[PDB]
């Protein structure tokens, strides 16, 4: 008898029920991981990346904190077999923006990495929801959908969940109210062509645009457009300051994971196919409000846009589609 | 009138009530910050460091995630006025040991950095608890205590809380039991010379040493002593693989912050001024199990140690004192 | 020496920092208590009531679950000295209406009861926020205000926070969307005479009244008016089925406590002094959206109401003032 | 089209972490609220025979949905509402009346469980059963016999609460949080439970080694009275408020957390103990068990003194003396 066999009588000689994989152990990947771990969303966490040392080191560092977590198994490996049986696979790997660089400048590189990553994910977790975080997220969500063969409910991009969170933060600062009570939606591209939906902004269901008709216009004496300009510029400013962004996106992704894993059916602005709305007929992916739960995106909310908002959203779709349409698979 | 005044009728025109400061926004400081944020331990978090762009970028990145948090105020700056009225001030800043640098010279460089940091902390939060996380932690805890002029109860080193968490992770992995139910205490000097207290190692109050009398000796067929060696060497391996450790330390610190901020009077093995115990006769800080609460360390547990355990604590104390006695304050 | 002194060396020989008191240990009082305990809002919980057996039993039962909580001190007694230094005191005690007793006489009995409770609360926690949960809440919040001598930011009635949560539950059931994503506000007097603000009802900032102009009217083929009718009748139905309500009130009250204790500045529809809105000239308390934080109600939202909505609030205000002016303090 | 169709464009048409609570008395509802506030389930079902009370409790919980993260709460007298539960927690049954023998009380619960348990098994054949009804060690056996489940899926709440109470009282005496005051109460829940003095420790320091009289009648400090108070505390609460609820609910939610999240923490729960401590009969008593996704996967074999071991054997004999008389 070993010490274990003297101490413990074994009765039972099972897959995880709530496994999540994070692909990519860069700063974004690891912020997603710690955020998911601290939210108790998974019974198993797997990490995958191509840099073996860094991957192992990250895994071990999380494991050493196990005592303080409620996720009893953390694994990693360059081989996708460690990701088998995931309910949710979060893809953060690939090139990221350098100072001053457009997320759209990342397309060729990250499409080529997705050509390797997505078939491997799909092979080991054929029923997962895919949550794409890598940039440009809207384009890569389309790509992941096309490569995976998944129905589109199961391919979700982090999209404008973060842009909307930034927007509500800044709104909150101007009004003196917690972001949880400042409502406003940013839709379209997670990037420079995003669309603030001024007509929907409210606190306690009081329309800000009804109170302030010039809201969001160039004529606005309070220059509320500058809030959206700051939303657009946020990642660039943070990158210039600390080299990359990580915490906000990690929190946003864990917010999405929470709705998925706990089947909440909360609404979030995430990247999905919008064909059929606003007279768009192209297979373009961008953010609109979607109901998120255990089957991914189960429904879209049809937002009532002003003609100016709709035009902006159409411009966003045209910019994204002009890229997506030329991709070769 | 402004949109704000049209929307909102002000009744009242702020002293922080549950504030935590983190000094140093390297990987350790930010892991402490995110862990504290995700455990809802503070109503205000202040970040301070000397590199202003990086500091602002970290702050902004955390603020952009505010929607997903319950800590409504996040501030930063090089000026310690941002830290005023902290209940708890966590010090992670300092110099890293260079190739060829003696331990004595490294500590002296950290003394010189502490002579700027500590009096600034003390000026703005004179009644805080100081929690030192910078390496080498036991010596820098002494440094902070001497410079601050604080009573012993309010100067705490992170010490062996992380070593014991690592130990319990490794134990759990061996026994197939969650670390929460695998008990064991690593005491003394953090890291290389720490002491595993084999007599206290247990599951459900069943003493493993009693069940397996070779436990923790060279001759043990199951080489349980390897578990402690792995705790010591775990860090080395993580450093060699990813460059540094961060996540486990962050979670360890947030565990300590939880007991302090919530006045839990849980017991943790943290570094405290131990002159008076164990035949220790110098002003050194070593980990023993301490009751932690709103006044810092209020009580400590007198662990019964074997002759060999006691000798190893004394050797550490002599070694620490041997460096401390050479420092220029 | 004793066992404790052999085990523990004492360093220091305590004011609670985040203490909450619940007055009244009926079902509502105890549901507030468990809800607060399970949200880790307090470092000390005090219970007070006049029925000494039941009070001690409730206290002990909660104490027996301390292992599973993070509120290290739970106390109780008939004497208000156990309430000292509370940040928040939650009042759930009050009269039951008698057959044939006028609403005026009933409120007068609560005045006389509050003339005992409130000055004893004020003696031991002069700087607390008072949260009145007792029915009829709007008038009892006025009574507490008048007896306490507190400024009006520190006297808060639970008001329509529950009514709005019910409304959102029912909305979410009809739409297949989590109530967190179904926005809508019920204002004015809690319960029978509450006002649903149809203009504010929305998902992702999309106004349902705009999409469906008959919303809230008797002309509506979908009878959305029945949602509010169910909000009003809900307590009646739950009372007929189980004898009383408790759980929802507890959870609602814990939501309010969270904003106050953590200084969140979230907006909640709670009872506050609304003299000067809506052509109301009297010292009456009714629910409007209020910003809640560490100083209680700091601000209120001026909701644009329809002529009918406004007239309903004014009518509640007139009825309340008709009673209040005949009370003897 | 309908408002709902004008607002929402539908793309898509089984709960994955579902819990059922059987019985909506004080204990059942305390379990329900504790489970809801710990976010352990994506669906909660409630079942009892008293339909008004059941519906009222369901609605009162539902009205709190905004504040919870359990998006579906259902109830009914028909066990079809409990389909596909991972964990079914049984709190229903008869309470012992004036003049009633233990045997007859148990039989009355056998007759109730003959309805409840097969209904549970029909709709959630792969669930774990957690028996909370009193006397728990015997009714766990009853549930096991009626269900036909393997031993690992039939768990009694057992001494998890006794142990929590003991650590509360130990903590009060020492001025340390219960989380840092370790000690295990085993065997039969309640009156005949056994405090294992040898495992009582703070930070791995054995109190018994420091204080050899610990747990003996000789003890100047009367530490035996801490265990007496564990037994008597319940009687006291019952005398004061009429019943106990909150602590049972928190204890049961602690067990459910380990099961639902596959934590493999160790808890002292009621499990079939035949083959230990000289016990040869099919009886359930509390020992420390590893709890996870498949129920009880492993038992910790605590080293007991002869006296402690005799007390469990006596309990086993008494339990078996009752069980052999029951009519299934
Ligand atoms: O994760 C850890 O456990 C960790 C990370 S760094 C770390 N260190 N660092 C020293 C250290 C640092 C500078 C010195 F001059 C020195 F002599 C030692 C000791 C540790 O135990 N330990
Ligand atoms: O859940 C609820 O919404 C609820 C439970 S009781 C409840 N009440 N209770 C009164 C009430 C209670 C005693 C009185 F003397 C009285 F004049 C009114 C009004 C409510 O709206 N409302
Ligand atoms: O909170 C508790 O700890 C508690 C509440 S009831 C409770 N009981 N109930 C019995 C019990 C019930 C019926 C019987 F026929 C019998 F012989 C014993 C034993 C407990 O230990 N214990
Ligand atoms: Zn919200
Ligand atoms: Zn523990
Ligand atoms: Zn180290
Ligand atoms: Zn009511
Ligand atoms: Zn009992």
Cβ neighbors of D230 (< 8 A, separation 6 or more) are D162, D165, D166, D169, D185, D193, D195
CA C136 – ligand 2 centroid, Å: 6
Distance CA B65, CA A169 (A): 8
Token reading at D5: 């169709």
Q: Is B47 annotated as a binding residue?
A: yes
Q: Which of C60, C212, C237 sits opposite D59 (nearest CB)?
A: C237
Q: Evaluate whether B79 touches B47 at the Cβ level (below 8 Å).
A: no
Q: How remote is the CA of residue C250 from the centroid of ligand 7, in Å?
A: 13
- Provide Rg for chain D, Cα atoms: 21
Q: Obtained via which technique?
A: X-ray
CB contact under 8 A, A304 and C267: no
Residues 6+ apart with CB under 8 A from B101: none
CB contact under 8 A, B262 and C70: yes
Please give the Cα distance from A303 to D13 (Å, whole number). 22
Shortest CA distance to D168 belongs to which of D227, D107, D97? D227
- From D177, D180, D264, residue closest to B176, measured CB to CB: D264
A173 and A314 housed in the same domain: yes
Asked if C168 and C317 sit in the same domain, the reply is yes
Q: Quick one: which of A212, A114, A208 has its CA closest to A155?
A: A114
CATH number at residue D97: 3.40.50.720
For residue A301, the enclosing domain spans: 160-327
The bridge status of strand C296-301 relative to strand A285-293 is unpaired
Instruction: Report the gap between the CA of D326 and the closest CA in chain C (Å).
Output: 33
Q: What does the block give as tokens for D240? A: 């004061």
Report DSSP letters for B165-198, one per residue: HHHHHHHHHHHTS-GGG-B--EEESSSTTEEE-G
Q: Which of B64, B178, B183, B190 is catalytic?
A: B190
Between the alpha carbon of residue A90 and those of residues A48, A154, D17, the distances in Å are 10, 12, 21
Resolution value in angstroms: 2.0
Q: Nearest CA of chain C to the CA of B219: how many Å? A: 32
Same domain, B244 and B269: yes
Q: Nearest-CA distance from D64 to chain A in Å?
A: 15
Cβ atoms within 10 Å, residue D20 = 29
D223 and D322 together in one domain: yes
Mutate to test the interface with A, among B5, B41, B54, B67 (most CBs of A within 10 A): B67
Domain membership of residue D100 (yes or no) is yes
Q: For residue A2, is it within any domain?
A: no
Q: Of the residues C144, C159, C174, which one is the last residue of a structural domain? A: C159
Task: Show which of B110, B133, B159 is a domain's final residue.
Answer: B159
Distance CA C240, CA D52 (A): 8
CA-CA-CA-CA torsion for D116, D120, D123, D125, nearest 10 degrees? -140
* Nearest CA residue ID for atom 21, ligand 2: C191
Same domain, D28 and D144: yes
Domain final position from D158, D185, D201 = D158
- Co-location of A46 and A150 in the same domain: yes
What's the gap in Å between the CA of C153 and the closest CA on chain B? 7
Based on the domain organization, do C143 and C211 belong to the same domain? Answer: no
Query: B96 a known binding residue?
Result: yes
Is B204 in contact with D202 (Cβ distance < 8 A)?
no
Pairing of β C285-293 and β C266-273: antiparallel
Residues D143 and D223 in one domain: no
Q: Determine the Cα–Cα distance for residues B255 and B247; give it in Å rounded to an integer.
A: 12
Task: State how many domains chain A has.
Answer: 2
Residues A243 and A321 in one domain: yes
Residue among B255, B61, B227, B99 nearest A240 (CA): B61
Q: Is B81 annotated as a binding residue?
A: no
Q: Which residues contact A297 (CB under 8 A, 6 or more apart)?
A: A152, A153, A156, A270, A272, A290, A291, D11
Sheet strands (E) in B77-166? 88-91, 129-132, 155-157
Cβ distance B165 to A68 less than 8 Å, yes or no, reads: yes
For residues A110 and A254, state if they share a domain: no
Q: Is B8 within the bounds of a domain?
A: no
Q: How many CB atoms lie within 10 A of CB A79?
A: 10
Nearest CB to D42 within list A6, A12, A263: A263
**Number of Cβ within a 10 Å radius of residue D137:** 29
Spatial separation of the C-alpha atoms in residues D3 and B120, rounded to whole Å: 61
Q: Which ligand is nearest to the CA of C95?
A: 2
Torsions phi, psi for B9 (to 5 deg): -95, 115
Residue of minimum CA distance from atom 3 in ligand 1: B235
Establish if D6 belongs to a structural domain.
no
d(CA A183, CA A202): 5
Q: Report yes or no on C307 lying in a domain.
A: yes
According to DSSP, the residues that pair with D89 across neighbouring strands are: D21, D130
Distance CA C22, CA C34 (A): 11
Q: Let me know: does B176 contact D290? Beta carbons within 8 Å.
A: yes
What angle is formed at CA B82 by the lines to CA B77 and CA B84, rounded to 5 degrees?
A: 155
Asked if residue A6 belongs to a domain, the reply is: no
| Cβ contacts from B onto D, under 8 A | 94
Between CA B129 and CA B113 the distance in angstroms is 19
Query: Are B263 and C301 within 8 A, CB to CB?
Result: no
CB distance C303 to C327 below 8 Å: no
Assign residue C182 the CATH number of its domain: 3.90.110.10
Residue A65 phi, psi dihedral angles, 5° rounding: -90, 10
Distance separating alpha carbons of residues B97 and B191, to the nearest angstrom = 15
Q: What is the DSSP letter of A17?
A: S
- Of the candidates B73, B33, B26, the one whose C-alpha atom is nearest the C-alpha of residue B49 is B26
Q: Is the dihedral of CA C264, C268, C272, C277 positive or negative?
A: positive
Beta pairing class for D295-300 and D284-292: antiparallel
The DSSP H or E segment spanning C132 is strand C129-132
Cβ-Cβ contacts under 8 Å for C112 (sequence gap 6 or more): none
Find the residues whose C-beta lies inside 6 A of ligand 2: C 95-97, 106, 135-136, 190-191, 235, 245, 249
Do residues C53 and C194 share a domain? no
Q: What values do phi and psi take at A301, rounded to 5?
A: -90, 130
SS3 state of residue B88: strand
Task: Please give the C-alpha separations between residue C104 and each of A4, B273, C136, C319, C328, in angstroms, as whole numbers.
Answer: 73, 66, 11, 11, 10
Whether residue A303 is annotated as binding a ligand: the answer is: no
Contacts across the A-C interface (CB distance below 8 Å):
92
Catalytic center residues of C: 190
Please say whether the beta carbons of A269 and A164 come within 8 A: yes
Residue C174 CA, chain-centre distance (Å), reads 26
Residues A23 and A90: beta-carbon distance below 8 Å? yes
Instruction: Please tell me the distance from the alpha carbon of residue B217 to that of residue B226, in angstroms, as a whole number.
Output: 10
How far is ligand 6, taken at its centre, from the CA of residue B245, in Å?
Answer: 9
What distances in angstroms separate CA A183 from CA A43, A229, B69, C271, one per listed residue? 33, 17, 16, 23
Q: Select from D300, D311, D280, D298 the least CA-distant residue to D188.
A: D311
Residues C288, C229, single domain; the answer is yes
C3 within domain boundaries: no
Q: Which of A203, D30, B17, D66 is nearest to C256 (CA)?
A: D66
- Rounded CA-CA distance B211/B199 in Å is 11
Residue A157 vs residues A92, B69, D146: alpha-carbon distances, Å: 11, 22, 49
Which residue is associated with the tokens 């902070």? Answer: B144
Count of other CB atoms within 10 angstroms of residue A267: 26
Contact C67 D178 (CB under 8 A): yes
- H helices of B151-306, in order, are 161-175, 208-211, 225-242, 247-261
- Joined together, the tokens standing for residue A9 give 């009588």
Q: E-assigned strands of chain D? A: 8-10, 18-22, 43-47, 72-75, 87-90, 128-131, 154-156, 185-186, 194-195, 201-202, 205-206, 265-272, 284-292, 295-300
Residue B6 domain-assigned? no
């Amino acid at each position: 008898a070993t010490l274990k066999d003297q101490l413990i009588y074994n009765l039972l000689k099972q897959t995880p029920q709530n496994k999540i994989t994070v692909v990519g152990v860069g700063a974004v990947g690891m912020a997603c991981a710690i955020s998911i771990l601290m939210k108790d969303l998974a019974d198993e966490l797997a990490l995958v990346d191509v840099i073996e040392d860094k991957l192992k080191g990250e895994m071990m560092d999380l494991q050493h904190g196990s005592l303080f977590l409620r996720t009893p198994k953390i694994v990693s490996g360059k081989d996708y077999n460690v990701t088998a049986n995931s309910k949710l696979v979060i893809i953060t790997a690939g090139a990221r923006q350098q100072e001053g660089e457009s997320r759209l400048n990342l397309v060729q590189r990250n499409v080529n990495i997705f050509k390797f990553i997505i078939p491997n994910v799909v092979k080991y977790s054929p029923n997962c929801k895919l949550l794409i975080v890598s940039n440009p997220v809207d384009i890569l969500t389309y790509v992941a959908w096309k490569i995976s063969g998944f129905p589109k409910n199961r391919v979700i991009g982090s999209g404008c969940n973060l842009d909307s969170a930034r927007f509500r933060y800044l709104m909150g600062e101007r009004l003196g109210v917690h972001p949880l009570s400042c409502h406003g939606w940013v839709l379209g591209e997670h990037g420079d062509s995003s669309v603030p939906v001024w007509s929907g902004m409210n606190v306690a269901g009081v329309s800000l645009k009804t109170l302030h008709p010039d809201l969001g216009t160039d004529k606005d004496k309070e220059q509320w457009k500058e809030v959206h300009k700051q939303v657009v510029e946020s990642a660039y400013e943070v990158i210039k300051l600390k080299g990359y962004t990580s915490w906000a996106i990690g929190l946003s992704v864990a917010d999405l994971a929470e709705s998925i894993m706990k089947n909440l059916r909360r609404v979030h602005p995430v990247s999905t196919m919008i064909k059929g709305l606003y007279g768009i007929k192209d297979d373009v992916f961008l953010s609109v409000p979607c109901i998120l739960g255990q089957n991914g995106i189960s429904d879209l909310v049809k937002v009532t846009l002003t003609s100016e908002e709709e035009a902006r959203l159409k411009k966003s779709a045209d910019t994204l589609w002009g890229i997506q349409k030329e991709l070769q698979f």
